[PDB]
Design a protein around this ligand. Structure first.
Ligand SMILES: [Mg+2]
Ligand SMILES: [Mg+2]
Ligand SMILES: [Mg+2]
Ligand SMILES: [Mg+2]
Ligand SMILES: [Mg+2]
Ligand SMILES: [Mg+2]
Ligand SMILES: [Mg+2]
Ligand SMILES: [Mg+2]
Ligand SMILES: [Mg+2]
Ligand SMILES: [Mg+2]
Ligand SMILES: [Mg+2]
Ligand SMILES: [Mg+2]
Ligand SMILES: [Mg+2]
Ligand SMILES: [Mg+2]
Ligand SMILES: [Mg+2]
Ligand SMILES: [Mg+2]
Ligand SMILES: [Mg+2]
Ligand SMILES: [Mg+2]
Ligand SMILES: [Mg+2]
Ligand SMILES: [Mg+2]
Lengths: 75, 159, 175, 49
RNA sequence: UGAAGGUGAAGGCCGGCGCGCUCGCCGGCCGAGGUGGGAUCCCGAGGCCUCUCCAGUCCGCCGAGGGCGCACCACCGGCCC
RNA sequence: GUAAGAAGCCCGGCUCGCUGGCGUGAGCCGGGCGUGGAAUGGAGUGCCUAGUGGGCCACUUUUGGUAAGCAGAACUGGCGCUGCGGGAUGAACCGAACGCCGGGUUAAGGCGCCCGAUGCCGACGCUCAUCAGACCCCAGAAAAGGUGUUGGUUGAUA
RNA sequence: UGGGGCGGUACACCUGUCAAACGGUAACGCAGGUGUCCUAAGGCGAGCUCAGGGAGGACAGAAACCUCCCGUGGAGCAGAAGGGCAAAAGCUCGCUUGAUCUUGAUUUUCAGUACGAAUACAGACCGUGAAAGCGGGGCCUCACGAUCCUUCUGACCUUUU
RNA sequence: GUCUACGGCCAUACCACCCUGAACGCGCCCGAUCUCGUCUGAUCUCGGAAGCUAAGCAGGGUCGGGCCUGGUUAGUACUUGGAUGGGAGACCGCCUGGGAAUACCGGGUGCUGUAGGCUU
């Protein structure tokens, strides 16, 4: 009682019958596997970005008048 | 039935080409590999540490991590219909930047400029590639001479 | 290639220029075939054997029909050939009578299928020449070099048989 | 504006050639129909339409 | 949630007492955090047809552009053992 | 195998125990700039889930074997589940894929009679067999030979 | 299992080829190997050159030992083969014990599960080096094994109702 | 025109043998107290400056060997897709497209970045 032993005959029909779908990419990929010592600092930077907000509010407010400065100088 | 070794069928791939054995020319090391860069892979067998598998020799990928001596790469792989994404850590001397985008980059910069300058003109000029078109009705001169005349030749049992 | 009734076409051609060479040489050929779509194709067949060109690396400048100059004057033609049999490859020379060069060539392709059984894709034609009444090496054509020639029309078979199919008169085959 | 004009049109549904074809399994150098038959396409259209 | 003994799910912003030290003490305000995409909804220059001019209130719709953003998805962050 | 743009480019500013001649890098904020090679068509995502888990043939590539309608593989297409026109008949060869009817035209094959259609005033040649020949898969034959006959090449002689 | 039995193991593993130039791919198809060995044959630093060939030198001879020249690896690197290595990855000397303690991520076979083997990081304690640095076993490719049960190590560790 | 220190590309830069080398350099060269290591100041370390282009290095030469690159070999060999094409088979030809390598014959024989000297 002998038999077949290996075959890849029909298979490409099976594969394409539902398709061959590349993976679904996204922005904001995942941070699984990166260096610990680098990941650590990212936390500390985000843990303190709240500071500078007033100084940030000033600069981009003045720069908004100074961004108006284009349409001012244009007009 | 075949075996399952990690270097089965690599007599020639992980083999240095002719008259290029020896130490490594070390501009390979001094290059800069930042995140988001597009990279191709080629296993050098002169050094054995951190080299990838057969399946990734000749594939192209993209960086996600950076270590002291190596790089993390995201590579696709076709295995029985479905395709998978994979994160292989690889040392530097098995990689190289890819020129497979510099052409795109020359265009967008030239194209940004060429828009902004020559905008005051008013015309929306061509900005986007077109294929090879048909071939331009034109004349041909016989500066005097009649053409040559060809014909076949008799057979000969030269050997 | 198949065949119908053939025609002669004059095709002349050229390679494509390049920053190296500006005006390459022209090349002419004289070809026999049914129509102009096939003759362009036979042109690239020969010119590729001789020189080093192809269809993508060249252009067809002119393809046109050449007409017989004296189609009401009987003429003697001589034809040089290359074909290949089931064993090797051969050359030969043959002679014919016709009014037009086309018709003589056509008359060959039939003859070769009959004596030697060669299909048209196994034949190459080199040269054709209007030969004098002398210089004819073949006797079948020299029979007719006679100023005072004649013969009868001996045993002449009934054509038109199935007009009357059942008759009473047995026929006559003497005229 | 070629792309839009053609894709507006549905592909033409024709009838079989009145008179017959020589041999569809071969090229139009060997006595067939396939390949490019450049100007003689019009002769055929007269008989399909 | 842990083998068990046993523990047991939210923050900030501002001002007073120690040195913002990736830190402990007195008083108010909000409050289930955010990034991106997001069916619908909201505001709206100028109007589409007005037998003529200008004034021009009800009503659609446009439509520039701009906002509140449901479920759900991807990521960041936070809390409990 | 990659790439062919809004998940892009540019401007300015903030935070960092990370690294440090000074600096880099990454992350957050706020603004300015829309067609980015061809030809095609509606995409995405999640649950429950049966029958199967003995295979077979053909071109091409191919291993063992003298070979096999033999044994084992790669590529695509078919059979199995699939009728119909042709191959006289036929699992798979050639054409072509099916609701029930009318008219016209075709494919592949063919046109003496069985049997639908050449009952063309068809064209040019070859060939006579005291075993004639006759259409892929395909169902029968080689070396060597022949003043049988028709063509051709070469070299000589008149 | 080219009927079964006798024979063999194609029953878990490694190299080359067959295999049709990514990868993958069969038969009791070809040729061969494994169930080990190492206190150094592991790890750092320094210095040097291999196989052979030629010409000379008391006994000395085909071959002991000395010297010079040529020497792109034609030698060696534990074992089968394949790749790779020249002021090395080889030979010789000095010092040592990263063959240690601890989380998690990835690759290989693959269902995209486990064993085993391997890779790049992080925290500790260390060794060698003038220092850059290198090292958490053997230059790379193979050398090995679940629940249940038993035995040993560890914390002034929980329970014994 | 050219050298020194550090290098990148690693024979258009290598191998053998011949000619020339102003100035600055680079080296040869002279010794062994102390530093250091050798069976042996030969190599390695140190202290020096009488003499020298002989060598090394630099440039240059060879109807030079090799290397780099063209041509020819050749639209040849081979090859995708096709046919109720041939043939007893082995194999051959054709349509549509792509397209090599030897022999043989020519040419070339190091480019350069940073810092600093000579060439008054
Ligand atoms: Mg089975
Ligand atoms: Mg191979
Ligand atoms: Mg009709
Ligand atoms: Mg077919
Ligand atoms: Mg199932
Ligand atoms: Mg089906
Ligand atoms: Mg039938
Ligand atoms: Mg039959
Ligand atoms: Mg027909
Ligand atoms: Mg019949
Ligand atoms: Mg049994
Ligand atoms: Mg293959
Ligand atoms: Mg060393
Ligand atoms: Mg070692
Ligand atoms: Mg460590
Ligand atoms: Mg008790
Ligand atoms: Mg001395
Ligand atoms: Mg000198
Ligand atoms: Mg000299
Ligand atoms: Mg030379």
């Amino acid at each position: 009682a002998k038999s077949k032993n290996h075959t890849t005959h029909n298979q490409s029909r099976k594969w394409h019958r539902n398709g061959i779908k590349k993976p679904r990419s996204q922005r904001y990929e995942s941070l699984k596997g990166v260096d610990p010592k680098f990941l650590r600092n990212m936390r500390f930077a985000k843990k303190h970005n709240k500071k500078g907000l007033k100084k940030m509010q000033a600069n981009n407010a003045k720069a908004m008048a100074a961004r108006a400065e284009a349409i001012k100088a244009l007009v | 039935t075949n075996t399952k070794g990690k270097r089965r069928g690599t007599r020639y791939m992980f083999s240095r080409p002719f008259r290029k054995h020896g130490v490594v020319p070390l501009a390979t090391y001094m290059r800069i590999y930042k995140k988001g860069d597009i990279v191709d892979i080629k296993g050098m067998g002169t050094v054995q540490k951190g080299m990838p598998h057969k399946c990734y020799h000749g594939k192209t990928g993209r960086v996600y991590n950076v270590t002291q001596h190596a790089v993390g790469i995201v590579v696709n792989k076709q295995v029985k219909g479905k395709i998978l994404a994979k994160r292989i850590n690889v040392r530097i001397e098995h990689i190289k930047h890819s020129k497979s985008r510099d052409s795109f980059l020359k265009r967008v910069k030239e194209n940004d400029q060429k828009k902004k300058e020559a905008k005051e003109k008013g015309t929306w000029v061509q900005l986007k590639r077109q294929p090879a078109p048909p071939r331009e009705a034109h004349f041909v001169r016989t500066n005097g001479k009649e053409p040559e005349l060809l014909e076949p030749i008799p057979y000969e049992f030269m050997a | 290639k198949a065949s119908g009734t053939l025609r002669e076409y004059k095709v002349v051609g050229r390679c494509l220029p390049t920053p190296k060479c500006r005006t390459p040489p022209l090349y002419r050929m004289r070809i026999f075939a049914p129509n102009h779509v096939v003759a362009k194709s036979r042109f690239w067949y020969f010119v590729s054997q001789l020189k080093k060109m192809k269809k993508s690396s060249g252009e067809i400048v002119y393809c046109g029909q050449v007409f017989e100059k004296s189609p009401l004057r009987v003429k003697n033609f001589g034809i040089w050939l290359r074909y290949d049999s089931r064993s090797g490859t051969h050359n030969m020379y043959r002679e014919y009578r016709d009014l037009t060069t086309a018709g003589a060539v056509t008359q060959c392709y039939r003859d070769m299928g009959a004596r030697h059984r060669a299909r048209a894709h196994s034949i190459q034609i080199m040269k054709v020449e209007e030969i004098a009444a002398s210089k004819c090496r073949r006797p079948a054509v020299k029979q007719f070099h006679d100023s005072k020639i004649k013969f009868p029309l001996p045993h002449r078979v009934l054509r038109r048989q199935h007009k009357p199919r059942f008759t009473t008169k047995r026929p006559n085959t003497f005229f | 504006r070629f792309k839009e004009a053609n894709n507006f049109l549905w592909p033409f549904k024709l009838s079989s050639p009145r008179g017959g074809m020589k041999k569809k399994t071969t090229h139009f150098v060997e006595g067939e129909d396939a390949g490019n038959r450049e100007d003689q396409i019009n002769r055929l259209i007269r008989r399909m339409n």
